[PDB]
């Protein structure tokens, strides 16, 4: 858009595509096409019948909550804030 | 977080769900430069999100398996113990998240902000618990004008949804708020091509989020508020 | 976490260690679509690693000096005091990490996954503490099950190892369980070059690390059990 | 192999590269060949002298533990999950 | 200098250079020219009056912080170690 | 964290501050292999990235908006109350941060390595506040030997510097450490040009930081010490 | 020669001039297929490359200095002498060259095609001349057909154009015919960008000529038949 | 137009750019962008007074004739029939 | 083959693919992917009833030989020696 | 022209046709170096061309329309008038040309050398012209050794073929000799995939040209001699 | 050298790099690296005895010729004017 | 042709060989913008070229066996009978070839130019045909002149060079003149790097022809006028 005509004088482009089939890719990874990303808003939650294994319990209510809605299922999760 | 240069937001940039352009502001709150900042329910862009992705069940243009998606988040989990009048510190009886997607006036300066949250509740009576999220959008609110400040940015809206769950005695919850960033599929895109990549992208620009789904042969899974976060 | 259709995993489906054809399963746990899932000690597959990296003092073919490895990790730190009867709250003996590994039955739709844990030791009878682990498993087994639910996935195998250490008195321990994502080199690879790269990797999935490391020259570090991690 | 063959109809491949001699590389990083990625297991433990430096005992217990059987030294660690 | 030449024969080079204009990008952004990288050191602190919303209170103490002296803005911070 | 063959650091290697070849030891520590390694503030180098990124007044070389900057990191958050005797746990009248860059003799081996540490201060006595840093040099520079033994890693120098902050009455501190890992823009290099990759880096290389400031038509703000963190 | 999938006419595809869709044949030929293909004078898409380029006085968006240019050509030398009865045999009193393109009714299989001629002149009669070439049409639309059939080409026009001298008695005449294949820059694309390449021919696609040079500030050369070959 | 849209799925595009201010590049010159071309119809004569020199003769009325109205001048012309 | 092997360390290698759907392309055109090049042995003979326009004779005579057997249709033919 | 380390043929070092291992000398030519060099009637790898691009009507994988193919080539055109006693200098009652490809024993060092001749005829006699060419082998066999010699280059094969016509009175001919330099499609090569470029050329490596025509479900059009050029 | 300089603004580079080991490319072909050419001066002449296959005396004369002096061996030489 | 913006000559921009700064011109022409040319015969490029590809021989950095090099050139051929007083027509006693190359003296806006010629020789005097082309630069100095007022081009200097021989009784001779356009390898440049694109050409740019073959090892082979052409 009228938009995209500023940024490409500054040498921005938010072009963001992915080589594969029917699946989304992650912003950075290699063989993606374009320099820019889409993104969205994503807020769940999950729960799971406590057990002693702390970690174990969260690794499943975040899979479960990863799973719900908007799925964005076996997805290695970096995080950046 | 942010979203600037190099960005678009699903349901708005693009795939835009004209819930946007019939919703109204919760209220507003004052922005350094002294314009008001209104704040409308993420519900839209949320369900948008959804109507991409696909679900476990009726599944679409969801993440590569394996894949790496970087993802601007956060999240909190707690305990909620077998009725237990003894409920240790960090319990409760649900746990919530939200997020927040402000936009700024000039994008060429200023890169749009997620501003994000969670939280543990501590009284059963969910019915309550809305009362509080109901007040949140006003704390946050408030941290996103102070940034805004910290950088000089100026946003024209600002968008905030949650998730929250009653976890059943002895049961782990887990709230999560995650804004993801990636790439699009070429299928995903009607009528686009490998070798047009900038075209590929107006052509997202322009799709309205029901036009998609029609030019698809998609059903609408939003539908009329099918989906509760 | 995973690892799916972009990955491959070393030992395993390269470099193969016979190890795992002529091991046997520990038990099993019951998939949810009702088949079985067998589940292995995954030692064959760390000593792998072993052969291919290399150690401090025989270095092989180890990640560039301030590369940047992403790795879908976790871990634990703990203090064991000057004897000191008074033990504090997150302080204990010893310290341990454990990882999986389960590949999907069809890789095509379900990505391979991985499920790590880590904790601290409260006795100081290592004897004893192994006894806990030899039990995990069944632990972790469970959890697994529970998210191939979640995601409809199915495996075949599933291969989990640990790690531990007992901390002398006043010293911290840090267990720690990662799975690595990188490139191999050129010269790692026999008879291959930077202009066949698909050709590189089918040399790779074809020599089992027994192979390898003779048209290497290089000796067997794994040895006979020589590892203990 | 016969894998590979069904990915490719996809626009999936598992070519992963370095173009380092002898080292080799984290995946995303530039330079690297192929769109796919290769892993591993490694587990470890390691112990340091308790001082009153929290944070630095376990930057060394850390540092130890890297450096311990599969040694993958002076890395950068980003996290995924 | 005298150094990337060594450097240059084991396949590594340190170019590192940004597409855009005036502005620095991250190490592993798409577009970007060069297998190197260039980092620096910064420090600093910032406050934030105590609300309840503790998460809240962390986040713009965070942006007080990143924006004082050396400005790293509206940034998607990754974290290695 | 580290900073290995891939890199180069602002001040130091390019745009070099003379501030460098005029500083002397702090002190020296024992390496493993039996030389010294003497430590200096490093203070010259943060001056040094202030200059080339710019302030929020006075911007210059800065990370786009909404960019992904992978940064080496750690930090701390703590909360001084309204003067109240019970400062419960995590509380504190000060909060600080420190980080430390040590370069390799030979970063043909060795890369060189970041080592960063943070905490909250306890005397509302900034004057002491200090003492307790100029201390910790000492603290960090055993880790840093302890982690060269590590690795069999050897460095010449070691630079470390910190920030720190008294919060008010009622005021919650962050103190950050942080490492940026960049790529340069073209118009930060004088004489340089899309096409010429490699000898741009040449130009950097050889351009010390007064020389750039000028050539580029910057005041220095690092000036007389009038940077504060 | 020919033009086909990967190509498009300065003139006719792109900044097309509305000569064109204003001008009528000179006449038809029997295409194998049994349809007819009428014949234009090219003068349209002759001045149109003009205006592109420009010319050694008003040059515009010609071909770089040593640039390699491919162009399916041909040409022609032939010596006037003084007066000298005895004219040899390759000698004349003027040369000429002649150029045709046929687009296919189907650019999907049928390569658009290229057909060239040149040829010396034997009377000093100009006027005579022309009508020689004024024939000559009918004689290319035969060959020109001749090949359609030897492919089993289609094509729905033709247009043909030429270009002839009368040399001074001891002057050495040179005739050309030459279609060079090129790449545009960017600034002769208005709104375009070296980040939208696909994007940037369907401008072109879209300007017709006339506009082009309004958009572009330049004046028209072609003029009204300001131009002679 | 709708025709590149069925040559895309062929694997046809007709994208051809010059990475130079101002001038056209030859098709296959190396730093063009696309995998297309544009053409065009240049006919033009010109004269030269003779030497004995033939090919002299030759090369200057050619030159001549390039520079003849649609300026094709310092170029290096390959031959395609 | 085992040859190929030999070149490779010399940087040289063999890979010639047309990124269009059935079609051949001729070497150095861009798009294509490999630096090597696959050639073949055609030899044929056409004719045209004799006009007077020689050119066009021939033009045709050629026409109908690349048309004949080892098709080479429409195809822009450089010349190398 | 030349055929050196870039290339390949087609039917010899891929889609070979088995007629090449079953074919014997017609004679034999000293090389410089003192060994003799086989000559052998090129007429299966022209068919083997044939089957891979197919004919005008059953097209296969030919050139696309309006590609720039290089071809190391060369031709020769002449006039059979009607019948006319007088037949002027370049004419003749029919045309032929010729084509050599030569081997060398160590392409790492020498390229495969092409040698290409073409001529007119004067006797209406056809059978007689037969003889003219088969004794031309031995003419070229000669040139062939020369540039060898020229460079030091030694062959171990050498396959020659022809192509003639006799115009009809009045009729113009065009004997062509021309080696095209091309690059395979993806669709031509069973079981490729653009990801997998040096493997897809292993395959060509491989198959034989019988296979090819099977795995491809090509009728054989070379059939039995079936093609006269 | 500073009239690269100038060029690099206009989008010019004259970088010209064969990735073969020893041998020179021609300025086209795949492979090479950099948008630019180096030329030179060869000027020199063969003789063969002469024959009656005229075609055959001269590409014999002329491999004889190229083969003299400054050596360009087995080439497929394009002809550019 | 020409040799512009895209390119540099071996001898001349690279590699440079002293004869040039101490070359005297054999005369000078008037160009049309009023300033002379000086021209001075080119064996001191012709020599430096022989330098970089090798001979036969002593091969060094020559076209990569079976590549494509495109050359502006041309060429002639002529046959010297035995004896025999009836000459016919296109014959003589000895063939030449001659190449001009002229640089700009703003490269920026005019290219380089090439001008070749070639011929036969009438008379069996050699010492006779010398004069000839004594004279033949004249000739071409003055075409030179001609094409620069044509594109309004400038130049500074111009070197121009032959090749000529005598065909005994029965000898065809061939006379070339040609520029080959190439691209340079890595072991030709000292201390360079296929990392280094830019800077190797800068190392070209500055070793002089001397220099080159000294760091390379290389015996000049031009030596003393070693070299006749
Ligand atoms: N955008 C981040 C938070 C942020 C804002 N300023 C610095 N950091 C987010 O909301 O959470 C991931
Ligand atoms: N694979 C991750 C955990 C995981 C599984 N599903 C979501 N997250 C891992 O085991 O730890 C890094
Ligand atoms: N460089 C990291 C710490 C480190 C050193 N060895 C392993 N990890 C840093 O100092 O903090 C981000
Ligand atoms: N297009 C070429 C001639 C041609 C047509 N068919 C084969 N060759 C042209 O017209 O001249 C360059
Ligand atoms: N290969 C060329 C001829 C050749 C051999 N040596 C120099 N030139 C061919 O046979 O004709 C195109
Ligand atoms: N440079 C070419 C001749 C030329 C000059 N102007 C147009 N053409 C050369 O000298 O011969 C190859």
Chains 1, 4, 5, 8, 9, 11 share one sequence.
Not at chain 1, 54 to 80: F, P
Not at chain 2, 12 to 21: A, N
Request: glycine share 10%.
């Amino acid at each position: 858009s009228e938009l995209d005509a500023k940024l490409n004088k500054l040498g921005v482009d938010r072009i963001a595509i992915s080589p594969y089939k029917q699946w989304t890719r992650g912003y950075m990874e290699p063989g993606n096409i374009g320099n820019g990303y889409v993104t969205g808003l994503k807020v769940d939650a999950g729960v799971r019948d406590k057990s002693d294994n702390n970690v174990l319990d969260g690794i499943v209510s975040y899979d479960r909550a990863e799973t719900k809605n908007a799925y964005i299922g076996q997805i290695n999760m970096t995080t950046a804030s | 977080x942010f979203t600037g240069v190099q960005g678009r937001v699903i349901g708005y940039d693009i795939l835009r769900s004209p819930e946007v352009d019939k919703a109204k502001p919760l209220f507003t709150e004052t922005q350094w430069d002294g314009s008001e900042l209104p704040i409308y329910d993420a519900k839209p862009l949320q369900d948008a999100l959804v109507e991409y992705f696909g679900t476990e069940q009726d599944r679409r243009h969801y993440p590569a398996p394996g894949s790496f998606i970087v993802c601007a988040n956060k999240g909190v989990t707690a305990e909620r113990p077998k009725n237990d009048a003894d409920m240790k510190p960090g319990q409760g009886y649900g746990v919530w998240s939200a997020i927040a997607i402000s936009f700024a006036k000039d994008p060429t300066k200023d890169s749009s902000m997620f501003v994000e949250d969670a939280g543990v509740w501590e009284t059963p009576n969910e019915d309550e618990l809305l009362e509080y999220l109901e007040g949140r959008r006003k704390a946050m609110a408030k941290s996103i004008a102070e940034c805004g400040q910290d950088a000089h940015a100026s946003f024209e809206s600002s968008w905030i949804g949650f998730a929250y769950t009653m976890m059943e005695p002895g049961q782990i919850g887990n709230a999560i708020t995650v804004a993801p960033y990636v790439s699009l599929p070429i299928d995903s895109i009607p009528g686009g091509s490998i070798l047009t990549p900038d075209k590929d992208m107006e052509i997202m620009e322009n799709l309205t989020m029901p036009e998609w789904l029609e030019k698809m042969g998609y059903k609408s899974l939003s539908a009329n508020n099918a989906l509760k976060y």
